[PDB]
Amino acid sequence: SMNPPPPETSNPNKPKRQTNQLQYLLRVVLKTLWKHQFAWPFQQPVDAVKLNLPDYYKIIKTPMDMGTIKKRLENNYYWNAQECIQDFNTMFTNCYIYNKPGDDIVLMAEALEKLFLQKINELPTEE
């Protein structure tokens, strides 16, 4: 079995910016979720080989994880906050699509998503 290549975190011809909203997504949103006791399954791409999930990437065609998001933020890969918010939502949705309600991994995603929603509720107005 094989894992796909990870999502892109560098692309020199992609336009990019450093907005105050993207700064908040790194300093507040990512930092808060990354330190959480339930962050560990989401800190890197799903290793479907080691986890013995050969169907994972047959079902999940838009993978995303906080390790990739962290690199994208630190590399200033994004043009706007919506692109980064979409990455977080893709992460959570992938977990809910693949797994079953009440599974440990779903409870973990739900705890992180609740904090994500609380932080993005106070995304600053664009400077």
Ligand SMILES: Cc1cc(N2CCOCC2)cc2[nH]c(-c3c(NC[C@@H](O)c4cccc(Cl)c4)cc[nH]c3=O)nc12
């Ligand atoms: C091992 C395993 C089994 C199953 N099935 C259970 C019953 O049916 C047969 C197979 C589904 C899985 N889903 C993921 C998964 C992740 N695993 C991280 C791993 O360290 C892990 C492994 C177990 C629990 C946790 Cl909390 C974390 C990370 C992100 N998204 C995911 O979906 N792992 C699964």
